Design a protein around this ligand. Structure first.
Ligand code: CZY
Ligand code: MG
Ligand code: ZN
Length: 343
C-alpha cells in the first residue's frame, strides 16, 4: 500500500508542439488506446492536444508556463496500480476524442471544454490508492479537512490542482480577467467533484431526464449536467477500448483495491467484499460495474450524441466478453502473479 510522490522541460520547449498525426495516424479515433503511448511522450501529447483543439492560440497560453504546468500535473500523481498519471493522461485523451468526434462546440462553450480537459488532467491528483471510506476510517488529514463536506478525495484533487496554479511559473490562467480566472476555478471544482461515483448516483435520474427531454444549449443547468456526464465518460473510458484493455484495467483496479483491503485487515477492520482478495470474484464484480455504472453512462452519451453509439456497443460487447470468459476464471481474487493474461 506504499505509493510514492516523485517530488515535493527543455526537451518539451525545444522540440516544438507536434501535429497529432505525427504521434499516431489513429490518435484522434475512438479506437486509439492512449495507454499504448510511452509515458515519456505523454506531456508532449497533452501539448499537442491543446494545440490541435486551438486552446493555446485562443486563450493566449504561454507555452513555457504550459510545459511547466503539464510537468507539475504529471509529477502530482503517485504510483498506485491504477490511479496514476497514465490514468489521468488516458482520461484527458478521451476528452480530446469527444471534442474531435462529437460536436462538443455545438453543445458547450469553449471555456467549458477547456475546463473539462484541464480537469481531466488534474482529476485524480495525489490519489493514495484508497477510496473515500478509507480516508474516514484511517482518520486521515484529508478526511479531517473534507469528510464533513463530502467527496474527500475529489476535494483534495481540486485543492492539489489549485496549488499547482499557485506555483511560480505554472499559472496557465495568469493573464485571465478576474471573472474568467474565477469561472475556470468554479468549472474545475464542479467537474472534479463529478468524478465521485456517489455524486453520479445522486444526479443520475436528472441525466436520465436531460436525454429524455433533449439537450438545450440555452439551459445553463444542461451545460452543468452534460459536463458531469462527459467527465464520468472520460473517467471510465478504458471500458470503451478493446477486451485486452478492460482485462488489464480490471487487473490494475483490483490489485489497487486488494491492497486497500489488506491494509484495512491490518488495521483490524473488515473490508468491502470487492476489496477483499479472499472474497471478491472479479468477473461478477466487473459485470455488475459495467451493467450498473459504465453501460448507463455510455447509453446516455449515445442518447445525446448519435456518433457515440460505437462507444456504448463496445462497452456492452466487453461486458459480454466477461460473461463468456468467467467459466475460465474459477478463483476469488487474483492469481499468485497478479495477472489476468490466462484469460
Ligand atoms: C474509482 C472508480 N471505480 C471503479 N470501480 C470498479 Cl468496481 N471498477 C472500475 C472503476 C473504474 N474503472 N473500473 C473498471 C470510479 C468509479 C466510478 C466513477 C464515476 F462513475 F463517477 F464515473 C469514477 C471512478
Ligand atoms: Mg477519482
Ligand atoms: Zn479517475
Amino acid at each position: 500500500s506504499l505509493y510514492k510522490k516523485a517530488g515535493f522541460y527543455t526537451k518539451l520547449l525545444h522540440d516544438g508542439i507536434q501535429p497529432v498525426a505525427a504521434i499516431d495516424s489513429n490518435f484522434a479515433s475512438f479506437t486509439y488506446t492512449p495507454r499504448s503511448l510511452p509515458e515519456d511522450d505523454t506531456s508532449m501529447a497533452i501539448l499537442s492536444m491543446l494545440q490541435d483543439m486551438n486552446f493555446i492560440n485562443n486563450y493566449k497560453i504561454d507555452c513555457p508556463t504550459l510545459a511547466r504546468f503539464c510537468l507539475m500535473v504529471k509529477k502530482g500523481y503517485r504510483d498506485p496500480p491504477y490511479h496514476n498519471w497514465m490514468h489521468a493522461f488516458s482520461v484527458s485523451h478521451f476528452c480530446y476524442l469527444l471534442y474531435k468526434n462529437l460536436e462538443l462546440t455545438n453543445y458547450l462553450e469553449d471555456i467549458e471544454i477547456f475546463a473539462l480537459f484541464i480537469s481531466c488532467m488534474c482529476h485524480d491528483l495525489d490519489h493514495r490508492g484508497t477510496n473515500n471510506s478509507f480516508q474516514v476510517a484511517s482518520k486521515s488529514v484529508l478526511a479531517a479537512l473534507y469528510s464533513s463536506e463530502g467527496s474527500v478525495m475529489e476535494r483534495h484533487h481540486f485543492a492539489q490542482a489549485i496549488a499547482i496554479l499557485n506555483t511560480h511559473g505554472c499559472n496557465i490562467f495568469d493573464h485571465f480577467s478576474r471573472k474568467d480566472y474565477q469561472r475556470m476555478l468554479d468549472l474545475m471544482r464542479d467537474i472534479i467533484l463529478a468524478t465521485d461515483l456517489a455524486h453520479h448516483l445522486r444526479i443520475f435520474k436528472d441525466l436520465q431526464k436531460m436525454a429524455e427531454v433533449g439537450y438545450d444549449r440555452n439551459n445553463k443547468q444542461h451545460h452543468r449536467l452534460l459536463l458531469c456526464l462527459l467527465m464520468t465518460s472520460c473517467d471510465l473510458s478504458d471500458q470503451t477500448k478493446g477486451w485486452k484493455t478492460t482485462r488489464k484495467i480490471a487487473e490494475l483496479i483490483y490489485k489497487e483495491f486488494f491492497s486497500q483491503g489488506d491494509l484495512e485487515k491490518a488495521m483490524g477492520n473488515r473490508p468491502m467484499e470487492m476489496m477483499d482478495r479472499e472474497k471478491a470474484y472479479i468477473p461478477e464484480l466487473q459485470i455488475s460495474f459495467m451493467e450498473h455504472i459504465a453501460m448507463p453512462i455510455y447509453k446516455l452519451l449515445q442518447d445525446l450524441f448519435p456518433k457515440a453509439a460505437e462507444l456504448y456497443e463496445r462497452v456492452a460487447s466487453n461486458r459480454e466478453h466477461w460473461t463468456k470468459v468467467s467459466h475460465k476464471f474459477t478463483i476469488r481474487g487474483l492469481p499468485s502473479n497478479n495477472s489476468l493474461d490466462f484469460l
